[PDB]
Amino acid sequence: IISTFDIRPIIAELQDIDVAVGGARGAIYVYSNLLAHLHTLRVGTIQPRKYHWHRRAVHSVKWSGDGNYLISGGYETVLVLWQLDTGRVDFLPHLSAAIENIVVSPKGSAYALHLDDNSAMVLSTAEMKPSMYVSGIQSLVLGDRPSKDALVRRVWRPIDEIASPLVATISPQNPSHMFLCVGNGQQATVGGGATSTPLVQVFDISSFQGVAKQAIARTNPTDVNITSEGVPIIEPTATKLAFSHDGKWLASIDEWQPPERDTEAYLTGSKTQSDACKERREIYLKFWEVGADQSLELVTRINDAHYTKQTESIFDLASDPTSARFATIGNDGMVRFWSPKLRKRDGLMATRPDGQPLRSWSCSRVVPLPVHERQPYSGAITFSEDGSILFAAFGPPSGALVVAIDTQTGTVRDVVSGMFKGDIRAMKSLSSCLIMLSDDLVVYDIVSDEMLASYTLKETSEAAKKLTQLAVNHQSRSFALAAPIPKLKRGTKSELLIFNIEDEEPKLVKTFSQVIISVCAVPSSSGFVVVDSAAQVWSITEG
Amino acid sequence: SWSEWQNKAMQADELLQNNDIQSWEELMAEVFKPEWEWPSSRSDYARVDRRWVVYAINKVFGWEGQNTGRLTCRLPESSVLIYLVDAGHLSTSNVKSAFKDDVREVDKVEELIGEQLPIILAEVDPTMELLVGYLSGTQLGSSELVSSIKLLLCSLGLDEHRTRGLGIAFSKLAACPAAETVKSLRRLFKPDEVLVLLNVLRAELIKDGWTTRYLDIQLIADLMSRCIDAVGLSGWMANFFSQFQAEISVALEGVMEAVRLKGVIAEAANYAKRARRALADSAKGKAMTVHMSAELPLGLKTDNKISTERVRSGGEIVARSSRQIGHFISKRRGIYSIHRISEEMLLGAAGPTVVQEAR
Amino acid sequence: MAAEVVPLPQLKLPSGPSPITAEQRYWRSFKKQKSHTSTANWPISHISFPA
Amino acid sequence: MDRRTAVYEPMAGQSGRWSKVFHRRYHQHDVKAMASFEGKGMSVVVSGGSDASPIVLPLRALGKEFHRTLPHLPQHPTVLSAPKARYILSWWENEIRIWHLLNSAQQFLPLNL
Amino acid sequence: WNVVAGAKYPSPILSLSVITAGASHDDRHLAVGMQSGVLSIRTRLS
Amino acid sequence: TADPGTHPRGRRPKLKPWQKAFRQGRYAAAVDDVLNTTAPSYDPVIALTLLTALRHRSALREALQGRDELSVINILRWAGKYVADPRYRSICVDVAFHLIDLYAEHVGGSAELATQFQQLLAKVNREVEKAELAIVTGGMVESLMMSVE
Amino acid sequence: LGTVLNQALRTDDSDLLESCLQTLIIQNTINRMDSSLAGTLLSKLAARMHRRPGRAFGLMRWIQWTLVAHGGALVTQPDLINRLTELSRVLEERSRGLSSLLALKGKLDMLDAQLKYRKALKMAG
Amino acid sequence: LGTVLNQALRTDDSDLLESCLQTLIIQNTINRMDSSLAGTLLSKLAARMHRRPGRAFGLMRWIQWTLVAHGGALVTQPDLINRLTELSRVLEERSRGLSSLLALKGKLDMLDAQLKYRKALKMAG
Amino acid sequence: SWKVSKPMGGRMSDIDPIFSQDERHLIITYNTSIQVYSTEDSLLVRRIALPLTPSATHIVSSALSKSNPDYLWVACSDGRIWHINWTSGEGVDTPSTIDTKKLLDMAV
């Protein structure tokens, strides 16, 4: 099955052509001479030369200049060069993502690669370093041309889908930059049945270029992308990532469980493969110190942040806007406050080699949450705009409840029940009121103990219900939610709603031709920044 | 649409100053959607709104401000009250929203209201069917549940409607976290009332059959452990605790025995199921390796049928050729087997009979 | 942007609630031991060195 | 010795330049010897290796016809029996191995096999 | 003033000094004189 | 002439042969070269590093499925020796799961492996008693922190 | 005791199986048992264990030794496999609170040893 | 062994502490131990139990009898609850892995049962 | 009160990123955008935004005009063809339809 082809002309006449057909099974078939074979009823026996190195489908094949070399690139992130005068083969093996497109310069010198993680690098030959690098937003895209290795019915057929919203924070102390979670490539992210986004990139908003990139969860770019069976490996996804008040800390959570096909031997009684994969989870909670050059450094990693007989899922974390403090809500029930102390065992401090002391984060406070079990609970938390009170929605189905907890003391200041119809999706705290969404969307003032605005959203599928989310502005008191318009596919529309804090009328109603995957709030000014599926970014501002 | 509810609340205020309870009750029936007949489901109630709930609790219940108040029945005989009980609107957040004025100076408000309210429902009905309905209907904190267990043990410790709620409140107070249960139990219980409760939980343990043998749980162990830590040494500091730990060691040995038998019996059942599948296919004639005799084999391994699909490079899936299926079957034979061909096979109808040497 | 080949990072395994500290290894690093006995096994009164 | 058979045809254009058209592992051990034949409407190349199976490849239609693995067992059956005594018998390098079977097949319709 | 580290010798010790190298006074070796009549010098070189 | 971001004197991190075999995808050679305990370059944290990498890359079954009798006894001996540490009890129990699922058929064929399956139950039986005594004792600590309040 | 266990199960008797249940001879008993008859022994042991939670110090040796010597005959009876796969389902349900019940055993081993402590101190003072 | 344990926990010895830990005696030792060194004993037992997993029985016995004997002696301390916190951490790590380890224990108990059955056959044959 | 900015950024389409003449600029065609970067400093010199608006119409192909350089040929899935010129933007607001059912490819 033909994935691509490149033709070179053998020449001011046209004497012959040489066709290189890169097929979807992995091979590259070189048909050497065609016009002298089909110029002449009867033809002689034509037989292509087979060059098989790629496991998956070969994405791009091109002849190189003089015609000595056949350069190529596939899913395996390796630019390969067939020597073609000898039998040999030489390759530039470990790029960031899949080699989705190559071109050769008008002269023989430069190659230009379109890498699958929204990038282009003009390489020079035999220096083999990118003399020109251009990066984009790299988020999850519903692709127009679907995939080049979704043609031949693999073990996991690659589907154009968005399962979860993009994890992104605009960073204070530098509001032009945007930290957001990405994988190695788009196809390598969505492959495997789960989002595998073990990296973040910092992306400039004011001039739309990807500034830098770094690993958060464990990644192996220099290892093989595919298992021996043929399934692409999944890497730990950074689910919750939120940024501190100062501009100097960053806390992320990354989860990984083994795939369902892999267990097969841990099943004993009523244990299914999903139950075994859920038992064998790995949920790390890592604290990053952000340097001045947007370089993240680890300070602590907590292997089991919420633990009982087995490890517990962490549903949300939030940063206190008045101190350096991260609250995390878990599946055990408890809300934990983490704070930075200095490393000091017996008065003898441990310092970095330049001299500054080593900070380390640890659980300052534990707050057990009250449960109210009428006859799979999820959580959400947010601080105030002032600090000093943390609102914690705890989330069994229909009966769920928010608890307002003091920060200085661990006592419960308030509890409010009966405000959730289904499972809680998110909760933010504007200046006095909690804006929370489940199947309903409710603005609920706690200084008056009174719900102002209540909406019953339209019933949709579970993927769209997962992909609805909101964000508050905290400078001009306005919040903004995002919901695709009713399994997900390519052509879907989404509409975002700009509300003020006080009224019930939506202050801006705009639908978009593609589904928006993230809304974020610029911390310095009013307004928002939205990121679309067909991955373009645009800003909304009042005035 | 706040002004419409404000006018309706002022009209109900006019009905209160007229002291005509009947049209007020009919207006609450119309809002909640006298005769007052019920639907027979605690779940299947129609959705009502928060301001009418707040007005209902504000008109029914009462507060005494002397630096600490007391909820009281302004309407002790009301279908509105039993509807609030059955529809579960009697939560502490609801009553605080109803009484934001008088309680904003009051401290320890959750403890006071959680102590006072089930006492009030119990003095309303001596049969406490309304208390058991409240236990089954409302979101309940640990103070409310320990006061409700105090009420049911006051009643006991026609004759099953109390023990049903006694079973309900154990499940709820086992669902609650340890801290609130311990602090509310230490507050509202006396160290001999806890001994009464620990005899009730021993009645739920021994009569259930744990100490009893065969030839002649997680929600009660939490309650026992939380009561024991809530009393502590300040309550007790006899042979009662030695026989107590004897029966708990007996129940623990029973649970560990159940673990061992669970593992062994589940593995033997799964092997028997898959071996039944393989023996049915071998009786069809697909000629797999099955064990003959009646003891279990060493490796509990059955040969599955060969799948119709093959995983090619790099990961793709193609159809198995019958040629390759025949190759794998030729591997699956042993070193000696008797393969009887029948005259029905030579006619083309049936299949063979294979008896192979046991490897 | 060919990523540089990194080897396998060793696991930062968690430590128990009494790890060997930097100062404990610093005072264990006074390694090489020479035991010079006094004449006629006399107990050592005083050692000293100038500032 | 990588049990690999590779087929080369000359590159079109320049003279004296060969290139590997395609390779395939026909054998199960190394390919120690092969010889070709081309006449009377038959162009074959027979490759014998260490797995005792001579594999016949079509030469002029290579990539167009399937190969053929000739049997490694000899053409003479080399298995002989005395049925009245139920002795089966087979011979190789200098030994003759005789088995006796002691029972019927109707008796067995697995610990006794 | 917490017990940061320590060590144990085979005799009741009577004199103890860590002594310094030279410029900036990095401590060369620790010598303990014990009741048994032994001077144990433990050397650290950086 | 040094590429920027490397060592200027030119010290590249050279690969140990188990790292090279794991990188190329030769997991049998990787596990053998790591878990050989007679070798002087033996390290349980290196063994945990390779086995966690072989759980993360989906290949632990592939690493264990090609063995012979003596090396199955060697991996069983490592699993028995190192289920005791709860810092890698999970990975060690997973390796023992795959070894039971793969090699429980020759246990009458070889007597020495039948001891090594019985000696691994013998230490698994002593590690529930250690895990039950630590949750017995964890209740008493929980009782004392309640009475402090 | 090999021939008393044969007759007690074919008639589905209630009393005669219990006469052999309380009394190495037990292991040598069931190695000579008929295997379709051996499944009748497992049917009633799974019948008493499923109806009520409890314990049995003697039946742990009994049930396991029959599932090894006579578990391969379980393929012949499709009724007993479903009875054993609902039996091992409910024996998980007793197993869920083993962690919470072990912590209860800790507090009773704490308080009983502390109540004995003060009583010894009154005779010590 | 009370005064020896007092000396070891008061001057942070290792030889005296290990030679009194390797060994009724334990009950008399913890009952004659000083009250103020109980938290030091808890920390120095948690350290040995983390550093070496094979000594869990005796060390849990020591911690058990210490928490029996000096319970309110740790509450009158109460700014030092962090030693009990590190102890809870060590015991939580010790009790990690229990459900999967029980599953693997059953998977091995089947093999041991079959091997013992074939040994019981081979001795009589 | 609230206003929405025009979309910037974009996802790089699988159409080949074409080199300019004399190898100094690279023309990369995104979805809804075509922008020219410089090879030396890797800073963009122009961004030619392209109005796409009909749910899934995509830029199908793009190539330099082989008769004369510094022109393009950009074609959508529906019938639309632009003849813009990089270093400027003359040709965005004047497309030319082609009366297709759906345009699968084009080559100049």
UniProtKB/Swiss-Prot annotation, chain B:
It is found in: Nucleus. It comes from the Eukaryota. This is Uncharacterized protein CTHT_0071780. It comes from Chaetomium thermophilum (strain DSM 1495 / CBS 144.50 / IMI 039719).
